[PDB]
Amino acid sequence: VLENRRARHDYEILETYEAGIALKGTEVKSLRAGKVDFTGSFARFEDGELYLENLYIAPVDPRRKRKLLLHKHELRRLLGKVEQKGLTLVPLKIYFNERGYAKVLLGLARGK
Numbered sequence: 744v745l746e747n748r749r750a751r752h753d754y755e756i757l758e759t760y761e762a763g764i765a766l767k768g769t770e771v772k773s774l775r776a777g778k779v780d781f782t783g784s785f786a787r788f789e790d791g792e793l794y795l796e797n798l799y800i801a802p803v804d805p806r807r808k809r810k811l812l813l814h815k816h817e818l819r820r821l822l823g824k825v826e827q828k829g830l831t832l833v834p835l836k837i838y839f840n841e842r843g844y845a846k847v848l849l850g851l852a853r854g855k
C-alpha cells in the first residue's frame with residue numbers, strides 16, 4: 744500500500760472516494776515496486792472522465808494523465824464536489840485489490 748504522507752499531515756481530509764486506475768505499459772510493474780511520487784498530484788474531470796494528473800510512476804511519460812474508473816454510485820457522490828472553493832481532490836493511497844485491480848483512494852483536501 745502506497746501512501747501520500749504529505750496529504751495526511753498537511754491537509755484536513757473531508758469525504759473520500761475510491762476509483763480504479765487505467766494503467767499502460769510497465770506502469771503496473773513500477774507500482775508493485777512502490778516507485779511512485781504523489782507530489783503535486785490531483786484529480787479533475789475532463790470531457791466526461793475523471794483523470795489523475797501529475798502522479799509520477801518511475802520508468803511513456805512518467806507523469807502522463809491517467810484515467811480513473813468510477814462505478815456509477817461513486818460518480819454520483821463525486822459530481823459537483825470536485826470544483827469547490829479551497830478544496831482539492833487528491834490521491835491518498837494506491838493499492839491493488841484481490842483481483843489485481845489498481846485502486847486509488849481520493850480525498851477532498853482542505854488547507855490545514
Ligand SMILES: [K+]
Pocket residue numbers: 749752753
Ligand atoms: K507535513
